[PDB]
Subunit: 199 residues, 3 copies
Amino acid sequence: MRIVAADTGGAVLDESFQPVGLIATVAVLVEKPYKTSKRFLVKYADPYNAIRDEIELAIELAREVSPDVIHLDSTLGGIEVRKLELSKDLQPLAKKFWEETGIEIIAIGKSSVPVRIAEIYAGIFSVKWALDNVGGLLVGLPRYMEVEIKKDKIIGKSLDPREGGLYGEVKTEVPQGIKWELYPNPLVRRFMVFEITSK
Amino acid sequence: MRIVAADTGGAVLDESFQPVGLIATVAVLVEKPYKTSKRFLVKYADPYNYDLSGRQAIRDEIELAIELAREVSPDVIHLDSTLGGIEVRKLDESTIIWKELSKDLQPLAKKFWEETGIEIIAIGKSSVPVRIAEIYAGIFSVKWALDNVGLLVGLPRYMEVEIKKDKIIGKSLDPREGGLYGEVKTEVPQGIKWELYPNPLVRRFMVFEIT
Amino acid sequence: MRIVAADTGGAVLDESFQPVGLIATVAVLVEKPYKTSKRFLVKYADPYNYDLSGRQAIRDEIELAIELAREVSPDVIHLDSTLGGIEVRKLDESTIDRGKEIWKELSKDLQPLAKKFWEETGIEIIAIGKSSVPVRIAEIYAGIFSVKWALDNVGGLLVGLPRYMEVEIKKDKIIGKSLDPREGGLYGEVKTEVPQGIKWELYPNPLVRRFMVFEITSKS
Ligand SMILES: [Mg+2]
Ligand SMILES: [Mg+2]
Ligand SMILES: [Mg+2]
């Protein structure tokens, strides 16, 4: 099965580890064996000042790759959004999109692996954003994921082995003259902080 | 202590990764140090003609638990019903989906308690032996798929299997549970192949695909 | 950010695996990268003489946190009560609005303590509870100290550890570690002299999934 999903993640934190705003909305194409995505879109929000932005970006990707279904971040047991819970706002959108493409948009939320994969990529693109904006940043990553930074790419991985080894990967130019570290958010258990400093 | 628990796990999936029915119901005997079971029973259902509501599974679960309990005489029976550890023979609408299911479990547990003095408790996901039964269910579902294959089998929550020449090993993927596992002797056919990968519809659940 | 937190954990269990009482209350100083504590205080209860209202525990927790905070001067104290991070100074019955009904009896003891300590220092005590990593680290240390207590106080003893943690025994120390990799590798170490004539085993609590049992048995 080919699935398009979307989620928003990554948060700019203040000096007291309190979130200012979210960083990245990502749409991903996920196919078997459903551990990662090689095909995705990113929309950077403005962190320093929603489910709609996810569903829109998902639709944009779906028209490009023609998936079997779209997963949205709403936990409703996988019910088709056109056959519908604030996400009733998206029912008419789900209705007309199905009529146009034959693609079902389903409210599966936290039960969805592709949504989780989209979330991991949001974390990765949040780090990329940090790499490309850093004199010091605190980025709050999505729940239990870590990143590795190599010369030409960032790797994202879920910390939960129960998820079966979900991961992400984004090629990007990693600048010299930076210092990064990764550590637990003291205020939010199971969430990691990506702190970066320009040398 | 000596505990008997039961559960039903393993689901034949369709093309849309949605379950058509359940496969294996297992009763286990668990003793110290409570990581696995050396003594267990299994009952297979018909997955292609299954009561997906849950009534059938829980009936099979309590019947099979009782049966194993008669043989091994455990201190107590754990049922996969997350209701605070209350005795099933006292399950009323008052003490409380499960209201309906209590209707066909309460008299049965009451009868069994009168025969044996052994309580059947609705402890559910708080029970390690229940979880061990669930893991064995996944193992027996995989054994079943090895004998009825192609197939798409949805495994119980966060567990994987390894397939040897002479046995199937199941293990929890959650290290927080403390290394829960199970083994089942079996033979493995020729002219087949299998993969284990995330169920894209059910986070933290794995899929066993075989051809 | 430098944080002092406290929690009470570790339980003497009966052979039906039910807690008789809690053992250790621990206050910890936690600094970046917030994985462990190298500065901590411990107070032992009597598990056989224990109040599971939780009143005695939260009282012990706050006073021990304050005592430690006076010596290390943290930016903030984390208390294990999950209320969203409200300052305990401002914890009145008006602000509370059975969870509500319970914390208004406790507020009569907690609020003035927090108030007095803030006036002295400007340091806030926040009711953050379970989302706090330093609280979790305190909990891990409580599990460690409960084992140390059990080692010193045993012909057999079942120690119920706090949720998903293990302990390792070394010749000169006890190590505690979270079993949840999602927490990023939280742990703690306490130096002790391990007594002879005893054996130990770590295994799952069959009645409480994700809780381990540390059982000690006298030798010979
Ligand atoms: Mg979301
Ligand atoms: Mg069950
Ligand atoms: Mg506590």
